[PDB]
C-alpha cells in the first residue's frame, strides 16, 4: 500500500529468496549423498503404527502424508524421537528405535516423485534410508519453487513500489500547482 510498508516487505522477500536458494543447494548436496547411500541400502533391504519422517519442515507433503512413538519431531507436534533428518540415518538409529520398543514411510521414486528380531531393525533402517532420500529431494524441490515464487513476488512488489513512487510525486505536484493557480 504505502512505500515504507512495501520497503520492508521487499527487504524481507529478498532475504527469503536468497535463503530458499541456499536451502535448495544444501538439500541438493544432501540428496546427492542420500541417493548414493540408497543403492546398497536397497539390496540390503530386500531380505503398533508408528510413523517415519523428520524434525525439519519446508519439504512439502512429507510430514502431512505420513501423519504411540513416531520418529521425527514433526510427527508428535502434528499428532517419540528427536534429532532426525539433519544427519543421514544409520543402522544405529534403527537400533535405538527398536531397543526402545505396518511401517509408514515415504518411498523414493525420483527427484519429483515419492509415495507412502534383527529383521525388525532391518525394516526400520529400510524405511529410514528411503525416507531421507525422499525428504531431501522434496525439500530441494519445494525450495527451488519457493525461490522462484519469491523472485516473481520481488518483481511484482518492485513494480508496485515504483508505480506508487511515481504516483506520490505526481500527486504532490498537482496539489502544489492547484494551490498556485
Amino acid at each position: 500500500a504505502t512505500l515504507k510498508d512495501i520497503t520492508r516487505r521487499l527487504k524481507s522477500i529478498k532475504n527469503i529468496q536468497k535463503i530458499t536458494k541456499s536451502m535448495k543447494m544444501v538439500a541438493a548436496a544432501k540428496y546427492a549423498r542420500a541417493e548414493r547411500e540408497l543403492k546398497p541400502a536397497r539390496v540390503y533391504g530386500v531380505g503398533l503404527i508408528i510413523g517415519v519422517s523428520s524434525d525439519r519442515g519446508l519439504c512439502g507433503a512429507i510430514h502431512s502424508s505420513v501423519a504411540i512413538i513416531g520418529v521425527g519431531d514433526k510427527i508428535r507436534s502434528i499428532l517419540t524421537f528427536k534429532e532426525v533428518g539433519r544427519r543421514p540415518p544409520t543402522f544405529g538409529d534403527a537400533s535405538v528405535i527398536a531397543l526402545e520398543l505396518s511401517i509408514i514411510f515415504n518411498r523414493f521414486r525420483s527427484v519429483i516423485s515419492y509415495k507412502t528380531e534383527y529383521s525388525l531393525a532391518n525394516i526400520i533402517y529400510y524405511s529410514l534410508k528411503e525416507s531421507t532420500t525422499s525428504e531431501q529431494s522434496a525439500r530441494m524441490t519445494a525450495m527451488d519453487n519457493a525461490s522462484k515464487n519469491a523472485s516473481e513476488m520481488i518483481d511484482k512488489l518492485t513494480l508496485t513500489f515504483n508505480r506508487t513512487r511515481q504516483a506520490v510525486i505526481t500527486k504532490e505536484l498537482i496539489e502544489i500547482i492547484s494551490g498556485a493557480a
Binding site: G57, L58, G60, S64, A67, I78, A142, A146, N149, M153
Partner: protein, 156 residues
C-alpha cells in the same frame, strides 16, 4: 477513485467484479468478500440463507488471509486444519462460478439459472464437507450441485 467510491452509498446492493478473479477463470468475476446487500439479514432471508452465506464468507476470508504464505511456499506447508479450509474454499470459489445464457460463445457451455433453494443447499453441503472427496474442477462452471457430482463421475 472518487467516482466509484462516491457511488457505493447510493446503492442497496453492490456486485463488485475483480480482474484477478476473472483472470483465474471465475465468471461472473464477483468478489464474494466485497459485494453487499441491505437484505442480507436473517430476519429478511431467514436464518438458513444467512448462516450459509456467512459460513461461505468465513471460509473464503480464512483462505484469503493465507495468501501471503501460499504465494511463497504453496499449500503443502499449511497445517491439516488450514489445508481443509483451503480445499473447501477453492471448491466454493468454483461453485460460485456459473455459465451465463449470454456468455455461451466464451464459456462454451449452455447457460444455467439456479433456484435460490438449490443455491443454498449446494453451498450448505460443501461447507458440511459432503463433497470433500470430489475434485475441485467438478465444481467449475455448473448450475446446481448435482451437475458437479455428475461431472466428477465422468472424471473418475
Amino acid at each position: 477513485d472518487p467516482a466509484p467510491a462516491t457511488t457505493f452509498a447510493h446503492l442497496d446492493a453492490t456486485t463488485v467484479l475483480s480482474r484477478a478473479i476473472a483472470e483465474l477463470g471465475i465468471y461472473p468475476a464477483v468478489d464474494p468478500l466485497d459485494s453487499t446487500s441491505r437484505i442480507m439479514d436473517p430476519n429478511i432471508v431467514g436464518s438458513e440463507h444467512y448462516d450459509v452465506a456467512r459460513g461461505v464468507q468465513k471460509i473464503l476470508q480464512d483462505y484469503k488471509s493465507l495468501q501471503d504464505i501460499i504465494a511463497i511456499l504453496g499449500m503443502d506447508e499449511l497445517s491439516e486444519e488450514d489445508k481443509l479450509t483451503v480445499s473447501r474454499a477453492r471448491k466454493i470459489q468454483r461453485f460460485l462460478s456459473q455459465p451465463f445464457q449470454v456468455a455461451e460463445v466464451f464459456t462454451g457451455h449452455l447457460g444455467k439459472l439456479v433456484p435460490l433453494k438449490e443455491t443454498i443447499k449446494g453451498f450448505q453441503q460443501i461447507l458440511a464437507g459432503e463433497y470433500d472427496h470430489l475434485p475441485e474442477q467438478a465444481f467449475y462452471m455448473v448450475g446446481p450441485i448435482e451437475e458437479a457430482v455428475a461431472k466428477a463421475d465422468k472424471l473418475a
